Enzyme design. Structure first.
Site, PDB file in Angstrom:
ATOM      1  N   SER A  66       0.535  -1.064  -0.120  1.00 32.77           N
ATOM      2  CA  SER A  66      -0.421  -0.026  -0.293  1.00 32.77           C
ATOM      3  C   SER A  66       0.574   1.045   0.288  1.00 32.77           C
ATOM      4  O   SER A  66       0.500   2.233  -0.559  1.00 32.77           O
ATOM      5  CB  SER A  66      -1.388  -0.104   1.184  1.00 32.77           C
ATOM      6  OG  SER A  66      -1.100  -1.182   1.057  1.00 32.77           O
ATOM      7  N   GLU A 106      -5.351  -7.645  -5.225  1.00 37.44           N
ATOM      8  CA  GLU A 106      -4.065  -9.385  -5.588  1.00 37.44           C
ATOM      9  C   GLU A 106      -3.183  -8.473  -5.580  1.00 37.44           C
ATOM     10  O   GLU A 106      -1.859  -9.226  -5.642  1.00 37.44           O
ATOM     11  CB  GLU A 106      -4.394  -9.326  -7.074  1.00 37.44           C
ATOM     12  CG  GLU A 106      -5.526 -10.242  -8.110  1.00 37.44           C
ATOM     13  CD  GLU A 106      -7.079  -8.745  -7.795  1.00 37.44           C
ATOM     14  OE1 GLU A 106      -6.513  -7.152  -7.413  1.00 37.44           O
ATOM     15  OE2 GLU A 106      -7.860  -8.545  -7.624  1.00 37.44           O
ATOM     16  N   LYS A 119       3.642   6.976   4.583  1.00 36.52           N
ATOM     17  CA  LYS A 119       2.649   5.809   4.171  1.00 36.52           C
ATOM     18  C   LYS A 119       2.954   4.329   4.268  1.00 36.52           C
ATOM     19  O   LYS A 119       4.376   3.520   4.137  1.00 36.52           O
ATOM     20  CB  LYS A 119       2.652   6.078   2.723  1.00 36.52           C
ATOM     21  CG  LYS A 119       2.577   5.130   1.867  1.00 36.52           C
ATOM     22  CD  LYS A 119       0.144   5.387   2.053  1.00 36.52           C
ATOM     23  CE  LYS A 119      -0.726   4.371   1.877  1.00 36.52           C
ATOM     24  NZ  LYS A 119      -1.333   4.913   3.521  1.00 36.52           N
ATOM     25  N   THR A 120       2.285   4.073   4.872  1.00 37.26           N
ATOM     26  CA  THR A 120       2.911   2.295   5.537  1.00 37.26           C
ATOM     27  C   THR A 120       2.240   1.694   4.368  1.00 37.26           C
ATOM     28  O   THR A 120       1.240   1.493   3.980  1.00 37.26           O
ATOM     29  CB  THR A 120       1.928   1.697   6.871  1.00 37.26           C
ATOM     30  OG1 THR A 120      -0.028   2.359   6.597  1.00 37.26           O
ATOM     31  CG2 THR A 120       2.105   2.382   7.775  1.00 37.26           C
ATOM     32  N   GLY A 121       2.421  -0.106   4.355  1.00 34.63           N
ATOM     33  CA  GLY A 121       1.528  -0.806   3.471  1.00 34.63           C
ATOM     34  C   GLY A 121       1.712  -2.224   4.527  1.00 34.63           C
ATOM     35  O   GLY A 121       2.759  -3.035   4.693  1.00 34.63           O
TER      36      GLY A 121
END
Length: 265
Positions: free
Chosen positions: A42, A142, A208-210
């Site tokens: 993300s 996905e 910003k995280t993922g």
């Protein structure tokens, strides 16, 4: 020794970790597995939104976008409420940054055009930034589920840190478009337990995280020292060992960030 310490954190948490802080005038680059591919997850939303900004009058933000309930794909904290109403491009930009909403991201890829649902345009935006390594190929979700060793939808710490750096600190965007993006990140809500938790509370942190499968957990941030000296921090991780269902380890990202803060300090 800083290599020797990231590799311990790897033992303690049983994960691959990748770290990148670009060089500045007075500090050397910090790097641990800075060139290995890791999944984008993300995090990519942050450059997706620069992509969307750098190619549409500041008046584009006010454009309304209609989706159906069918459209929502993954995690949509913001999206569900506004589906009847719709959202503007600027509201989508905000929700994709501050909340990591999958649906909002999906639309802003569709709003870039081209094949791959937007993913060719977007990888094209990164290229414009000098990044020949990264690539995006799927949409949410996905994109969070490609298997270890699969190149698609991957970046490296080094790559995504030099991107971030031109966006926020580089003149990659007009001072006003630059301010929006920074402000959206400065007010991210998904990032409390990662990089921000590793730095002392008087360092300013925007990020910003993922998060994804196989124990993936990323965080990219620009930090400011109390003195106001900015650095860029990329921290990536995964745990393919436990396979698809491996749990991501935030404490890892937050520990790895304290080692960095100490080196910077």
């Amino acid at each position: 020794d800083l290599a020797d310490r990231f590799a311990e954190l790897e033992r303690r948490y049983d994960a691959r970790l990748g770290v990148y802080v670009p060089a500045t005038g007075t500090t050397a680059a910090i790097e641990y597995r800075a060139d290995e591919r890791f999944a984008f997850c993300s995090t990519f939303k942050a450059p997706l939104v620069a992509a969307v900004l750098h190619q549409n009058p500041l008046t584009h933000l006010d454009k309304l976008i209609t989706y159906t309930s069918d459209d929502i794909r993954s995690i949509s904290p913001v999206a569900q409420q506004h589906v009847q109403t719709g959202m503007t491009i600027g509201q989508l930009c905000d929700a994709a940054i501050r909340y990591s909403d999958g649906t909002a991201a999906n639309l802003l890829l569709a709003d870039l055009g081209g094949p791959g649902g937007g993913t060719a345009a977007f990888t094209g935006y990164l290229r414009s930034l000098g990044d020949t390594v990264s690539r995006l190929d799927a949409e949410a979700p996905e994109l969070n589920r490609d298997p270890p060793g699969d190149e698609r939808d991957t970046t490296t710490p080094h790559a995504i840190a030099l991107v971030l750096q031109q966006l926020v600190l580089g003149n990659a965007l007009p001072p006003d478009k630059r301010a929006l993006l920074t402000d959206w990140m400065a007010r991210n809500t998904t990032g409390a337990k990662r990089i921000r938790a590793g730095f002392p509370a008087d360092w300013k942190v925007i990020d910003k995280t993922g998060t994804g499968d196989y124990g993936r957990a990323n965080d990219i941030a620009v930090v400011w020292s109390p003195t106001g000296v900015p650095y860029v921090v990329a921290v990536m991780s995964d745990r393919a060992g436990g396979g698809y269902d491996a749990e991501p380890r935030e404490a890892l990202l937050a520990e790895a960030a304290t080692c960095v803060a100490g080196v910077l300090a």
